Short mmCIF file of C-alpha atoms in Angstrom, two decimals:
data_model
loop_
_atom_site.label_atom_id
_atom_site.label_comp_id
_atom_site.label_asym_id
_atom_site.label_seq_id
_atom_site.Cartn_x
_atom_site.Cartn_y
_atom_site.Cartn_z
CA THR A 1 7.49 62.88 -4.02
CA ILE A 2 5.80 61.76 -7.23
CA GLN A 3 2.47 61.87 -9.05
CA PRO A 4 0.44 58.77 -10.03
CA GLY A 5 2.24 56.42 -12.42
CA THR A 6 4.64 53.48 -12.67
CA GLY A 7 8.40 53.22 -13.06
CA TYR A 8 11.59 52.14 -11.31
CA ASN A 9 13.37 53.67 -8.34
CA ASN A 10 16.61 52.45 -6.73
CA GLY A 11 16.35 48.95 -8.17
CA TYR A 12 12.65 48.48 -7.39
CA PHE A 13 9.51 48.75 -9.51
CA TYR A 14 6.94 51.14 -8.07
CA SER A 15 3.29 51.86 -8.79
CA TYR A 16 1.18 54.73 -7.49
CA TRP A 17 -2.45 55.21 -8.47
CA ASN A 18 -5.36 57.30 -7.18
CA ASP A 19 -8.92 58.12 -8.27
CA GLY A 20 -8.39 61.83 -8.76
CA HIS A 21 -9.31 62.78 -5.20
CA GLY A 22 -6.52 64.68 -3.46
CA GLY A 23 -5.02 64.56 0.01
CA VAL A 24 -2.37 61.98 -0.88
CA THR A 25 1.40 62.45 -0.80
CA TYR A 26 3.36 59.44 -2.07
CA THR A 27 7.16 59.44 -1.80
CA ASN A 28 9.85 57.06 -3.03
CA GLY A 29 12.84 56.77 -0.73
CA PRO A 30 16.24 54.97 -0.80
CA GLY A 31 16.38 51.27 -1.60
CA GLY A 32 12.94 49.70 -1.44
CA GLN A 33 11.48 52.40 0.79
CA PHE A 34 8.36 54.47 0.17
CA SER A 35 6.14 56.65 2.34
CA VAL A 36 2.57 57.77 1.96
CA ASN A 37 0.81 60.36 4.07
CA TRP A 38 -2.83 61.02 3.33
CA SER A 39 -5.54 63.35 4.58
CA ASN A 40 -9.15 62.71 3.57
CA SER A 41 -8.13 60.99 0.36
CA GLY A 42 -10.26 59.17 -2.16
CA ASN A 43 -9.21 55.68 -3.29
CA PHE A 44 -5.46 55.14 -3.85
CA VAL A 45 -2.85 52.35 -3.90
CA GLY A 46 0.92 52.77 -3.93
CA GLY A 47 4.09 50.82 -3.22
CA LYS A 48 7.34 49.17 -4.30
CA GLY A 49 8.29 45.75 -5.56
CA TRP A 50 9.05 43.86 -8.74
CA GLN A 51 8.02 43.76 -12.40
CA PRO A 52 7.36 41.02 -12.99
CA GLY A 53 6.85 39.21 -9.70
CA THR A 54 7.39 35.46 -9.31
CA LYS A 55 5.32 32.63 -7.89
CA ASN A 56 7.91 31.73 -5.25
CA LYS A 57 9.23 35.08 -4.04
CA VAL A 58 9.83 35.53 -0.32
CA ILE A 59 8.98 39.16 0.34
CA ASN A 60 10.26 41.09 3.33
CA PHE A 61 8.78 44.30 4.67
CA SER A 62 9.04 46.50 7.74
CA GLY A 63 7.77 49.89 8.81
CA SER A 64 5.10 51.96 10.45
CA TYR A 65 1.45 51.79 9.46
CA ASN A 66 -1.10 54.10 11.05
CA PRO A 67 -4.43 54.30 9.19
CA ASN A 68 -7.49 56.26 10.34
CA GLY A 69 -10.26 54.78 8.23
CA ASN A 70 -10.44 52.23 5.40
CA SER A 71 -6.95 51.13 4.40
CA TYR A 72 -4.72 48.09 4.10
CA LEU A 73 -1.10 47.02 3.82
CA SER A 74 -0.50 44.00 1.62
CA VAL A 75 1.44 42.18 -1.06
CA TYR A 76 -0.43 43.32 -4.17
CA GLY A 77 -0.11 42.07 -7.75
CA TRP A 78 -1.52 40.77 -11.04
CA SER A 79 -1.23 37.87 -13.48
CA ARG A 80 -2.44 37.65 -17.08
CA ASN A 81 -4.13 34.77 -18.90
CA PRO A 82 -5.86 34.41 -16.59
CA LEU A 83 -6.19 38.07 -15.58
CA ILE A 84 -6.02 38.06 -11.78
CA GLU A 85 -5.65 40.79 -9.15
CA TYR A 86 -4.47 39.34 -5.83
CA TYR A 87 -3.74 40.43 -2.28
CA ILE A 88 -1.97 38.99 0.72
CA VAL A 89 -3.17 41.42 3.38
CA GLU A 90 -0.80 41.80 6.34
CA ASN A 91 -2.61 44.63 8.10
CA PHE A 92 -5.61 46.91 7.65
CA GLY A 93 -7.74 49.51 9.39
CA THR A 94 -11.48 49.91 9.87
CA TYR A 95 -12.54 47.74 6.92
CA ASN A 96 -11.63 44.12 6.17
CA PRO A 97 -10.95 44.36 2.38
CA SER A 98 -12.26 40.82 1.85
CA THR A 99 -15.74 41.97 2.90
CA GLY A 100 -18.38 40.65 0.52
CA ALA A 101 -16.06 38.06 -1.01
CA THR A 102 -16.62 34.30 -0.93
CA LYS A 103 -14.46 32.36 1.56
CA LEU A 104 -12.81 29.31 -0.03
CA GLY A 105 -10.74 28.11 2.89
CA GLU A 106 -7.74 28.89 5.06
CA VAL A 107 -3.96 28.70 5.08
CA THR A 108 -1.36 28.92 7.84
CA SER A 109 1.68 30.86 6.70
CA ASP A 110 4.49 32.93 8.16
CA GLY A 111 3.21 32.63 11.74
CA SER A 112 -0.49 33.31 11.17
CA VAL A 113 -3.69 31.83 9.79
CA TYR A 114 -5.00 33.63 6.72
CA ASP A 115 -8.57 33.51 5.43
CA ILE A 116 -8.80 32.85 1.69
CA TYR A 117 -11.42 34.50 -0.51
CA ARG A 118 -12.40 34.96 -4.13
CA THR A 119 -14.63 37.59 -5.72
CA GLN A 120 -15.36 38.86 -9.22
CA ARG A 121 -14.66 42.42 -10.32
CA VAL A 122 -17.13 43.45 -13.04
CA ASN A 123 -16.13 46.06 -15.62
CA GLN A 124 -13.47 47.60 -13.34
CA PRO A 125 -10.09 49.23 -14.03
CA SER A 126 -7.16 46.84 -14.42
CA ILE A 127 -3.66 46.58 -15.85
CA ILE A 128 -5.23 46.07 -19.30
CA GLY A 129 -8.01 48.64 -19.03
CA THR A 130 -11.67 48.23 -18.12
CA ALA A 131 -12.43 44.53 -17.63
CA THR A 132 -14.05 41.72 -15.66
CA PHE A 133 -11.63 39.56 -13.68
CA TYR A 134 -11.31 37.54 -10.49
CA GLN A 135 -9.73 38.82 -7.31
CA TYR A 136 -8.02 36.44 -4.83
CA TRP A 137 -7.50 37.33 -1.18
CA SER A 138 -5.47 36.00 1.75
CA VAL A 139 -6.19 38.08 4.87
CA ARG A 140 -3.85 37.69 7.83
CA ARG A 141 -5.74 37.22 11.11
CA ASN A 142 -2.82 38.54 13.14
CA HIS A 143 -2.12 42.00 11.75
CA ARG A 144 1.49 43.16 11.62
CA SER A 145 3.69 45.95 10.27
CA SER A 146 6.80 43.92 9.45
CA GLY A 147 7.84 40.40 8.56
CA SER A 148 8.35 38.00 5.68
CA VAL A 149 5.77 36.67 3.22
CA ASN A 150 6.42 33.44 1.33
CA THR A 151 4.13 34.14 -1.59
CA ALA A 152 4.33 30.49 -2.67
CA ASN A 153 2.36 29.39 0.40
CA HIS A 154 -0.58 31.54 -0.65
CA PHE A 155 -0.46 30.75 -4.37
CA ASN A 156 -0.31 27.04 -3.61
CA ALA A 157 -3.19 27.35 -1.12
CA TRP A 158 -5.25 29.22 -3.71
CA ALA A 159 -4.40 26.58 -6.33
CA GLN A 160 -5.57 23.94 -3.86
CA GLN A 161 -8.89 25.80 -3.73
CA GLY A 162 -8.93 25.84 -7.54
CA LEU A 163 -7.68 29.42 -7.94
CA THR A 164 -5.34 29.39 -10.94
CA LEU A 165 -2.79 32.15 -11.61
CA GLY A 166 -1.61 33.22 -15.05
CA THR A 167 1.71 34.79 -16.04
CA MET A 168 2.80 37.25 -13.35
CA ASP A 169 2.72 40.99 -13.95
CA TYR A 170 3.88 43.36 -11.19
CA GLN A 171 4.17 42.33 -7.53
CA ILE A 172 4.55 44.92 -4.79
CA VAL A 173 4.03 45.70 -1.09
CA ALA A 174 1.45 48.45 -1.17
CA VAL A 175 -0.53 50.72 1.10
CA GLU A 176 -4.13 51.39 0.10
CA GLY A 177 -6.51 54.02 1.36
CA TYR A 178 -10.19 54.49 0.69
CA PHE A 179 -11.71 57.82 1.73
CA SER A 180 -9.74 58.04 4.94
CA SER A 181 -6.60 59.53 6.46
CA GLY A 182 -3.37 58.01 7.69
CA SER A 183 0.36 57.62 7.30
CA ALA A 184 2.79 54.83 6.51
CA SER A 185 6.45 54.21 5.80
CA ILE A 186 7.52 50.85 4.39
CA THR A 187 10.81 49.29 3.30
CA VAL A 188 10.57 46.32 0.93
CA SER A 189 13.28 43.76 0.10
#
């Protein structure tokens, strides 16, 4: 069980961040496993993966995801020059994270249609401090708690919609929570 921060555990990069509100217990397990149990948390995001990620990685994940309020399970990562924060949402509860974003199109990948969106984050935290950057989204219509994600399908779809990606920074499978409660246990590979 660790506090917010980044590092490596059992061959995988991990990142855990929260807004200072408590109620969150994030734990790194064997291999690419991590578990997060939260009770009336604030905003937080945590998970395991790679540093840096690639633009053709096939990511596998499996586990249990039981949110009770705003939350989502997704491939989460960044790129620099251009600075981009992206998500390939596999499951979520109560609130579709793409809400308010502009829809650019759709893509059919790994057994489901995903809705593609783009939105701008103004003066928000990021891997390089406070900044303004674009956020790309691929939201799976058929929610699931395990499977494989061919990241290339989404990056290529985004590129088709004119959404360029810079040099990859971290790339993980993360569980997010936003003023809610819930539990999750995920193994990444």
